[PDB]
Design a protein around this ligand. Structure first.
Ligand SMILES: COc1cnc2[nH]cc(Cc3ccc(NCc4ccc(C(F)(F)F)cc4)nc3)c2c1
Length: 289
């Protein structure tokens, strides 16, 4: 968990990085765009996303970034996650070099796309596009699940779009301003994305792959509503916790076929083991796309 080894195959020279604009910034971290020179086997020169701490960060934050790095090394690579390209551990602050995704997170892309289509009164989205997006994050999640890996924050804001509009699951983490983010509710000590959480996660503080499958259900909802907020208009309070515990589910989104909303409902099984596996979801979605 903390005792994994950082392999130095990933080690990259920070002086071979030319930084661009900041892509996102949290309290104690940020993601900045950069150009790396001689990166990888083929000595590629490409645009990367670099994840780093700010000056405000302390040893606590340093440890987390390192651990995250150790995990990304452990996991392996898959087309539908945000891959680790390299890391700078020596001679300065820890820098994490990952794939750069031209279109940013899925949530804004969906929201800004929808506005463009409404406009008249790139090209517009069609139902195939949402199926593909949904499909791809399933392949990605299914990859983690094969590694006994738990994301604990599945949502459209942490799903990124590269060229060709290929979806990759990531985690902004320190690079997200969750202190002022209303999608993150203050429960006790922690700030949690409550509306995406399985009931067992909220109450028993239990996180499994199946709790991630629940969160994926919420994700499908975001996609087929073109970026609406989950449980819209509903304040997170005692009533809201009771409702979820008693099997309250959102209504069908405007753009979901009934079989897609059916799969949303299966993700929201109150019993964790009754929810689908990510592979099940993948093969079904692949077929629809
Ligand atoms: C905004 O415009 C962009 C453009 N390209 C981009 N590439 C990566 C990000 C944001 C980002 C940067 C790094 C990162 N890494 C954290 C992480 C943790 C865990 C995984 C995992 F588990 F899915 F493998 C992936 C990524 N996750 C997300 C980005 C933002």
């Amino acid at each position: 968990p903390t005792q994994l080894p950082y392999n130095e195959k990933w080690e990259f020279p920070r002086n071979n990085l030319q930084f661009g604009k900041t892509l996102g910034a949290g309290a104690f971290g940020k993601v900045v765009e950069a150009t790396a020179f001689g990166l990888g086997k083929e000595d590629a020169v490409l645009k990367v996303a670099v994840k780093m701490l700010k000056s405000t960060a302390h040893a606590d934050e340093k440890e987390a970034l390192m651990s995250e790095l150790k995990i990304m090394s452990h996991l392996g690579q898959h087309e539908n996650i945000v891959n680790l390209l390299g890391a700078c551990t020596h001679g300065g602050p820890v820098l994490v070099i990952t794939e750069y995704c031209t279109y940013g997170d899925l949530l804004n892309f969906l929201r800004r796309k929808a506005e463009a289509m409404l406009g008249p009164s790139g090209r517009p989205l069609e139902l195939r596009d949402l199926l593909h997006f949904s499909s791809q994050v399933a392949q990605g999640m299914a990859f983690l699940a094969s590694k006994n890996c738990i994301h604990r924050d599945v949502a459209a804001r942490n799903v990124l779009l590269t060229n060709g509009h290929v979806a990759k699951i990531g985690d902004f983490g320190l690079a997200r301003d969750i202190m002022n983010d209303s999608n993150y509710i203050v429960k006790g000590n922690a700030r949690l994305p409550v509306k995406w959480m399985a009931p067992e996660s909220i109450f028993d503080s239990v996180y499994t792959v199946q709790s991630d499958v629940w969160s994926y259900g919420i994700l499908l909802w975001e996609i087929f509503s073109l970026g609406l907020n989950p449980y819209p208009g509903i304040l997170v309070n005692s009533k809201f916790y009771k409702l979820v515990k008693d099997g309250y589910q959102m209504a069908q989104p405007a753009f979901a076929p009934k079989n897609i909303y059916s799969i949303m409902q299966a993700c929201w099984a109150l019993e964790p083991t009754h929810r689908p596996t990510f592979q099940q979801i993948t093969s079904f979605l692949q077929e629809q796309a």
